[PDB]
Design a protein around this ligand. Structure first.
Ligand SMILES: [Zn+2]
Ligand SMILES: [Zn+2]
Lengths: 54, 126, 217, 96, 110, 228, 97
């Protein structure tokens, strides 16, 4: 099987299951967060799972 | 004549499915008895593993309030000062009599350990 | 033609007054809760064992009494249906007592050297149409050598409701109705034997009474 | 209810035993103690199985013995005859 | 077990025949008459104590097959059947009990 | 071949059907007899409806070994909890010693895409069609043992519902959105829903992704197979 | 009706406390040609041969004294997942009463 942790993160189908489609305006998408800081669970989960979809 | 699958699981479900499919034409007489009063744990086969890593057992050492008293008694004085019987229930030997006199004095005294121990010793000598 | 035998006994809990045959105080008087050391203790025997007294395991008498009630009710219901019981023992500590008890009881026993598979190949070794043992009661699950007896293996291969007093070495998971508790003291063995004898006798008496009641028709 | 086990510090147990020199401070000048662990036939240092010392204590004892042998505070190939009055410390197998 | 009874009946019929037909009219003729008959009207021309014509009680010559210890419904009558050789184990248990009792109080065959 | 023989008192085992699987001629030298022409066989007997089971019977003969294996199988009848005789409960991803088993739940009329030995085993058990990727080495004995172990270790629907409590919700594509419960608890009912934690940790296989995305390509991908 | 722990809190094996160097009485239930199946109520039992004093007197149903030297007597060895248990005590003897 896949040699990763969360294989569902990269399966095409899971990526196509998205919905958000940025309009023809935004040019750059910068993101930054602290991983050791557990307070930022939302940003961590986002950068981990939704970045492939975006 | 039947099956002899032992390293599979429980014999209850085995007999159940054998009677359902039609293998065991004659229903075993003990089926109803086992169904009326089942055990607390189904006899399922379990390979005898070993505690390798940090796995420990849930059993611990039992202790009572009289354990420390008896330890102090054995430390102060010598061994038992009476031919213990242990044949009749709740036998009253020298150590047991001392523990009883202590529990009568401590607890139910609220003072100190040395004074009450000396009092119990004097009572025993009496 | 008597279908009431499959409904009358299996209806009320402790039909033959199972809980009254023994007593919690009578069982504690034998110090059955005692056990071997933690090292000798088995892994699967941990849930049934309570604590330890300076590396001396103690077994909660409540679970043992419940298992004993269950096993006694099972044996009584089996005797009500006329069945064979097989006693096993090899420690050679109370073989004479177990033999005398088997003589007193209306069943058979075998507490001697068990040859290589006498129940598995009973077709050729024993007679072709032999009433195989419908129940097993272990008096000393641990034989002379630190090795689990083959009786449990033959039972699992023959599907027989196994009974016995499991110690802190065997695998209760392999036995159907295990009974944790001591298996070395003399008073405990005597009490267990007397309880089994009384249970068998009372079950036979109740069976005879129910047969007479049926015949009253 | 009032008879459940308690989380005590394991009573009925005696503290661990000690060697013949635990709560002490060895010194390279104590020729008597240094030679006590030496045979008067070949100057061999008794081992741990018979002597019964700990790792650190035995290491320090043998280091002091070696220092005394090198510097010149103890005979190497034999035991100091001027300090023979020593009780039976080690279990001298020879001579019974 | 039925074979044993059949052979016993056959031997009885043969004895009755050898008694009535032959001159030896008394049915109580011992084995000496049979031996004389074998020596005379049966010159085996051999010397084997086994192959020679030996027609006597079948139980004395046959390895009797133990009958069914139990009739119908199973349930062996003996309380020591699963121990193999019930007689030997019963004798051993009796000897052990006798020894225990006598302790509490305080050539062979082939 | 013919069915197994009955028992002494009865037990009409003629209903079951025998099916020899493999044959092997073993040559083992001895002290004087030389290379012993020993034969080892693994036969599987069983008509269906869950009643089945494998066995082994090695000997220096043919019919004797066959009947010995048949008797052993008769004395070793395995049962497999099934749900609607057509497909297995759920998929299994086992690793028996050195034989991998990657099964996939498929509907009726799909076809038997598995080892011929596995095809015969399913025909004897009752399963009609079910996909299975015979990964790893191809060891008949070990593969069959692993398949039997997997079939014996399966979580049914009724037992799972009784343990957890929640009902079996499903949205079949063949039928309409109307959900039909397959199993219900035997007493209680967990009023609270399952912890719907998205992006779970389900270690799926790369073959699943290759089949879903159609990326798999070879000279023997999904070609037409024989009939029957 | 007393609970299970209530009886264990006031039992002989628990009331005596430890098990090392004690004065306890015993009794015999079976006599051997030389050994003596001494008993004192508990888990296992003990054995001993005919001593000097009261040699021929220690018959079936007599009374003896024990010292309690590990009721179980068990030790773990190197090449053995299980500990080599003895299931006996064999404590030191003294006399009658
Ligand atoms: Zn044990
Ligand atoms: Zn040291």
């Amino acid at each position: 099987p896949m040699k990763g942790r969360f294989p569902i993160r990269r399966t095409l189908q899971y990526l196509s299951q998205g919905n958000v489609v940025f309009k023809d305006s935004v040019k750059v998408m910068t993101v930054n967060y602290n991983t050791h800081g557990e307070l930022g669970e939302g940003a961590r989960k986002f950068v981990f799972f939704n970045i492939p979809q975006i | 004549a039947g099956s002899r699958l032992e390293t599979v699981g429980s014999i209850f479900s085995r007999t159940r499915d054998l009677v359902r499919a039609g293998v065991l034409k004659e229903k075993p007489l003990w089926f109803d008895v086992y169904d009326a009063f089942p055990p607390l744990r189904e006899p399922v086969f379990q390979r005898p593993r070993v505690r390798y890593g940090k796995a420990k057992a849930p059993i611990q050492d039992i202790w009572y309030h009289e354990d420390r008293i008896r330890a102090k008694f054995y430390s102060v004085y010598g061994s038992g000062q009476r031919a213990f019987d242990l044949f009749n229930p709740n036998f009253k030997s020298t150590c047991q009599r001392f523990v009883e006199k202590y529990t009568e004095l401590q607890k139910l005294g609220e003072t100190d350990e040395e004074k009450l121990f000396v009092e119990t010793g004097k009572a025993l000598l009496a | 033609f008597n279908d009431k035998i499959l409904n009358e006994p299996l209806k009320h809990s402790d039909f033959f007054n199972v809980k009254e045959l023994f007593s919690v105080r009578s069982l504690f008087d034998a110090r059955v809760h005692l056990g071997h050391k933690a090292g000798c203790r088995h892994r699967f025997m941990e849930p049934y064992i309570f604590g330890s007294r300076l590396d001396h395991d103690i077994i909660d008498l409540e679970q043992t009494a419940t298992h004993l009630q269950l096993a006694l009710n099972f044996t009584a219901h089996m005797a009500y249906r006329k069945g064979i019981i097989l006693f096993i023992s090899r420690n050679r500590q109370f073989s004479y007592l177990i033999e005398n008890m088997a003589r007193d009881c209306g069943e058979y026993a075998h507490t001697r050297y068990f040859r290589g598979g006498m129940l598995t190949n009973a077709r050729l070794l024993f007679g072709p149409t032999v009433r195989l043992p419908d129940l097993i009661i272990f008096l000393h699950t641990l034989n002379n050598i630190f090795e689990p007896h083959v009786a449990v293996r033959d039972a699992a291969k023959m599907n027989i409701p196994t009974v016995g007093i499991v110690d802190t070495n065997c695998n209760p998971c392999l036995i159907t109705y295990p009974v944790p508790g001591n298996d070395d003291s003399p008073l405990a063995v005597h009490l267990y034997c007397r309880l089994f004898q009384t249970a068998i006798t009372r079950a036979k008496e109740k069976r005879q009474q129910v047969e007479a009641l049926y015949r009253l028709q | 209810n009032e008879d459940l086990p308690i989380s005590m510090e394991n009573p009925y147990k005696e503290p661990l035993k000690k060697c013949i020199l635990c709560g002490k401070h060895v010194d390279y000048k104590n020729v008597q103690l240094l030679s006590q662990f030496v045979s008067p036939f070949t100057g061999c240092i008794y081992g741990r199985h018979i002597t019964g010392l700990c790792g650190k204590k035995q290491k320090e004892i043998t280091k002091a013995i070696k220092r005394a042998q090198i510097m010149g505070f103890m005979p190497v190939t034999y035991k100091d005859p001027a300090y023979l009055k020593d009780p039976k410390v080690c279990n001298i197998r020879y001579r019974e | 077990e039925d074979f044993i009874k059949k052979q016993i009946e056959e031997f009885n019929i043969g004895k009755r025949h050898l008694a009535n037909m032959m001159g030896e009219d008394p049915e109580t003729f011992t084995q000496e008459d049979i031996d004389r008959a074998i020596a005379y009207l049966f010159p085996s021309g051999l010397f084997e104590k086994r192959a020679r014509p030996v027609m006597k009680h079948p139980e004395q010559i046959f390895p009797r097959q133990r009958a069914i210890q139990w009739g119908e419904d199973g349930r062996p009558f003996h309380y020591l059947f699963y121990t193999g050789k019930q007689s030997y184990y019963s004798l051993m248990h009796d000897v052990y009990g006798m020894l225990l009792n006598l302790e509490k109080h305080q050539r062979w065959l082939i | 071949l013919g069915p197994p023989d009955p028992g002494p008192c009865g037990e009409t085992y003629e209903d079951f059907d025998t099916r020899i699987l493999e044959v092997r001629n073993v040559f083992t030298m001895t002290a004087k007899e030389g290379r012993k022409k020993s034969i080892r066989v693994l036969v599987a007997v069983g008509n269906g409806k869950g009643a089945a089971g494998f066995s082994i019977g090695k000997a220096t003969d043919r019919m004797d070994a066959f009947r010995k294996a048949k008797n052993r199988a008769v004395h070793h009848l395995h049962y497999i909890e099934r749900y609607e005789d057509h497909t297995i409960f759920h998929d299994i991803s086992l690793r028996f010693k050195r034989t991998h088993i990657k099964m996939k739940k498929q509907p009726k009329g799909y076809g038997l895409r598995c080892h011929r030995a596995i095809i015969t085993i399913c025909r004897l058990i009752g399963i009609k069609d079910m996909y299975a990727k015979v990964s790893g080495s191809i060891n008949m004995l070990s593969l069959t043992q692993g398949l039997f172990r997997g079939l014996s270790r399966q979580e049914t629907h009724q037992q799972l519902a009784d343990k957890k409590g929640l009902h079996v919700v499903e949205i079949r594509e063949e039928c309409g959105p109307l959900p039909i419960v397959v199993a219900s608890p035997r007493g209680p009912l967990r009023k609270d829903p399952e912890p719907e934690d998205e992006v779970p940790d389900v270690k799926l296989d790369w073959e699943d992704v290759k089949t879903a995305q159609g990326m798999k390509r070879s000279v023997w991908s999904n070609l037409k197979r024989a009939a029957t | 009706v007393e609970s299970f722990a209530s009886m264990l809190r006031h039992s002989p094996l628990t009331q005596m406390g430890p098990a090392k160097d004690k004065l306890v009485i015993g009794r015999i239930f079976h006599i051997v040609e030389n050994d003596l199946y001494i008993d004192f109520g508990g888990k296992f039992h003990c054995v001993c041969r005919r001593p000097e004093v009261d040699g021929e007197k220690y018959q079936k149903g007599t009374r003896v004294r024990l010292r309690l030297l590990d009721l179980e007597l068990t030790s773990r060895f190197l090449g053995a997942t299980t500990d080599t248990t003895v299931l006996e005590a064999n404590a030191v003897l003294l006399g009658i009463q």
